[PDB]
Symmetry: C3
Subunit: 392 residues, 3 copies
């Protein structure tokens, strides 16, 4: 009688699907993996970079079945995209684990589609936690593992021995485009927060404390007479920000969030970066070697805007986001001499509906384009006037 | 008291030898691994591609001892070759496991000679089963694993935690000629069937059902109103074939073999491709959404022929195979302007003996060449006449 | 309740630090890993090739803290260097395991700083023991493992499941500069012997049996009517050597050392090569198929000398080593037209002190240079005369 991962995998494997994609920007073809998050609705999480600029998206289960899927949401900053299987029949979803309970040394299993071979399983351990720096503009709080990960594994599952999702495989460190024992996955907690938003609104409503800062290193801790050699150093706090109102002052060092210690400023940024606006949280602070606790509430941010090419697959030069709560899709900013402004679009406009269907958020709008009508008729409102924009 | 593979390996390791080779086609040198299958006779399985075109073959045990070995059999199509240690003393053979009982997630151990370093052990898990496509003309039903495999590991052992052989390491997927976590081994069941033939006859007597077909994918299953998204689709059945006699009709889908479900057409081809002629088997079929069962018996095939260069190490342009049962080595086909026809050889000839020794099959013939006589004197028969061909 | 390495790692990880280096020979920057061996004194073992030619050495603990370290000792031949943290506060040292009790198949954990990412943990097994040949002039008796090892892992820890050090990661076999499942570590026993010397004297006092020899292979064993296919073959024994006095004769084969069987001549060389002079040992010998036992005692050797560039960071062309016991640092040999002889230095000189501080060995001397005085004033003695050499 031998130890084996097989019993655990029999239940878990159907939960991991593989994504095939065709797109354009000049035609291309790509492939990766995805994880079923809601069996009934057919929701499937995956990497944003796998499904970015995709005209066609098809999903293949472990048992051979093929489905077509449509984009639901996407977040370039965290590299997480949510798609939806069309006509979801008899699916199996994965249960998610609490990634905050992960320790280095814990065992891991990776499941995905390397080089299109098909559903492939590999094993390792958690090598490190809170890794970041791959792209300093992205929100990254990676789990690192030595379970083999290669091209095609992206969007695939990283699970513990109990077949619970702890992460989504996103990247590797490889000088040769081949795995050398260093892989990175997005923690499952971040996935829980980002996807649950996309499901309802079509995008993520980003919150902010309103503080500038940098990594607290040992040298900086000497200059500042601080004991801790790690944490978020508050460079400054913006006026009229939640942080200011809360009582946070510059020269402060943030050591914990909601009880959980903080690896770094980068990690902290990644935590709050995924939480919805109006979230009640609490911070551990260190000022003058004295421990402080504070109650905060996330607020509106300037990072909400997303490009129009992301929604019309080829219409560049217009950023736009949800408005208030279910009040339509307001256009944030418009660039001159671009495909968007060529049909009339101007910043300040608020899309009320399209083709006689009401539009409250980006999801409802995307739901009309999924229909793929020959002509698109937007009912926007400029100032006190209602107008229409026709496409094609 | 710590868990360890060491106790298991102490028994198993002597069973894995490493093969050194010199050959020509222009001299070359290669090296790999092999597994002792019969300690008494000194039989050693290995990859055909390791010992192909070899003039000299030497085997080195784990304890340092060297032996010379001679070719017994070889199958390019499945990439399995059988050699024999000369003067076998005090060897240790490996027990074989039933590879049909393998599950993805099961633990694996690989043992071989990477880069000539010596007996090396690495570990992983079964990543996938029934992988094929590396070469569409070969019979491939690979076990895939993330246990490290590199150049020199070929012909080496893949075992379970109980030190039973489950596969023979053959290949890897590596853009850089270095392992990235994707290795392939030939299932131990296929090895059991192929080698047991080579031992007795010097080659494999291939059987065939006599059916054309292709992979059953989801799209094809829609066209054909079939429920299964995987299996072998019968394009057509050859007249006077075992399949025809059995009651198999085109548009059928094969779902099982001898009870065991079928991964693919490729796998099925690989299963029967290794079974000896006259084997009694049974197939699960699906026609018009109705389950069928059928009793079949393998029959003669056209794939039996092998090149003459394979036996004379440098005599090209004459294919030949065993004849009936122990009736000599008949020549299948002869090409013009080739080294073989330059000594007289013509297709239709039947080698009765060589150098006053009787020849019943290719093994007995190879046994005379192992002697390495200065002049080779073949007693062949063309029509009703007996003649002789001299070599060197 | 899941199995995990996390509990073991929590204790062990602080024991592994990462080393940053700046040097010159033309400025360079390198990085690797190191292991804390004595928490109180702040001793840290690492690879010689990591800290070679270093002007600045800084050490970063797991918790973020930075320290400066200074060279204590270094051995190019075994590739082991010892450094010392300056102002050691609240450190955690690692317990060492007996590497002679290692078996292939035993589980291993690697801990180091690949590509500067930070403290990274990976896992594998012992693939092989006593590997050597990477550099035939070095003393190598490597443990081989498939735990992922990459650039930056050097000097890092290799431990068993109990968090005991079994080796120090030194090298990998990689055609692409990326890990493919083949890593090498220096056994912990060799580290125990080499470092304990450097701590006291600043270098290793090498001992020798005084015997020429080569690897005993199967072919050589045939020629010599020997049964063993492995061991050290005595080509000849030097007169007035410990071996000669002991009763060792050419044509002998050494099979054991202090009871422990011998993998190879290379391994044997590596064992005694790390033992201090005057060590009492015993050898198992085979002569004329008869088992012999012998009592030996290591003696002075010619390999003691080390370059002057190693101690003055840029002063080439003068070899020098300790003298007798704590009698100063004698200069072995001097080359003409070199930076050393340009200040006067001549072979035969014995450094009694520097800058009014007494000098007994290379460690005490290195301790004066750690002060980094503007001018260095050596009190050497040529013949019966005492003189001084000034620097800068």
């Amino acid at each position: 009688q031998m130890p084996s991962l097989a019993p655990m995998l029999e239940k878990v494997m159907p939960s991991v699907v593989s994504i095939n994609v065709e797109g354009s920007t000049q035609k291309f073809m790509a492939l990766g993996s995805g994880v079923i998050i809601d069996a009934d609705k057919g929701y499937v999480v995956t990497n944003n970079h796998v499904v970015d600029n995709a005209t066609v998206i098809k999903v293949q289960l472990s048992d051979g079945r093929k489905f077509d899927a449509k984009m639901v949401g996407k977040d370039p900053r965290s590299d997480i995209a949510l798609i939806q299987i069309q006509n979801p029949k008899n699916l199996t979803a994965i249960k998610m684990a609490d990634s905050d309970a992960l320790r280095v040394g814990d065992y891991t299993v990776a499941i995905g589609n390397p080089f299109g071979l098909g559903e492939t399983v590999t094993s390792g351990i958690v090598s490190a936690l809170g890794r970041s720096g791959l792209n300093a503009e992205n929100y990254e709080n990676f789990i690192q593992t030595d379970a083999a990960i290669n091209r095609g594994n992206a969007g695939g599952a990283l699970v513990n021995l109990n077949g619970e999702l702890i992460g989504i495989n996103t990247a590797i460190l490889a000088p040769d485009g081949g795995n050398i024992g260093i892989g990175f996955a997005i923690p499952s907690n971040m996935v829980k927060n980002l996807t649950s938003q996309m499901v309802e609104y079509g995008q993520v409503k980003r919150g902010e404390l309103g503080i500038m800062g940098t990594e607290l290193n040992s040298e900086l801790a000497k200059a500042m007479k601080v004991d801790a050699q790690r944490g978020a150093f508050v460079s400054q706090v913006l006026p009229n920000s939640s942080a200011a109102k809360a009582g946070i002052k510059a020269g402060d060092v943030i050591t914990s969030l909601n009880g959980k210690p903080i690896s770094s400023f980068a990690a902290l940024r990644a935590q709050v970066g995924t939480m919805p606006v109006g979230s009640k949280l609490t911070l551990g602070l260190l000022r003058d070697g004295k421990q402080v606790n504070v109650n905060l509430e996330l607020q509106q941010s300037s990072q909400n805007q997303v490009d129009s090419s992301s929604i019309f697959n080829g219409i560049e030069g217009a950023e736009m986001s949800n408005k208030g709560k279910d009040q339509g899709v307001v256009v944030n900013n418009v660039k001159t001499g671009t495909p968007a402004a060529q049909i009339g679009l101007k910043k300040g406009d608020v899309i009320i509906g399209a083709n006689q269907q009401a539009v409250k958020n980006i999801a409802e709008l995307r739901k009309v384009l999924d229909s793929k009508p020959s002509v698109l008729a937007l009912n926007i409102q400029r100032g006190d006037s209602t107008i229409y924009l026709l496409m094609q």
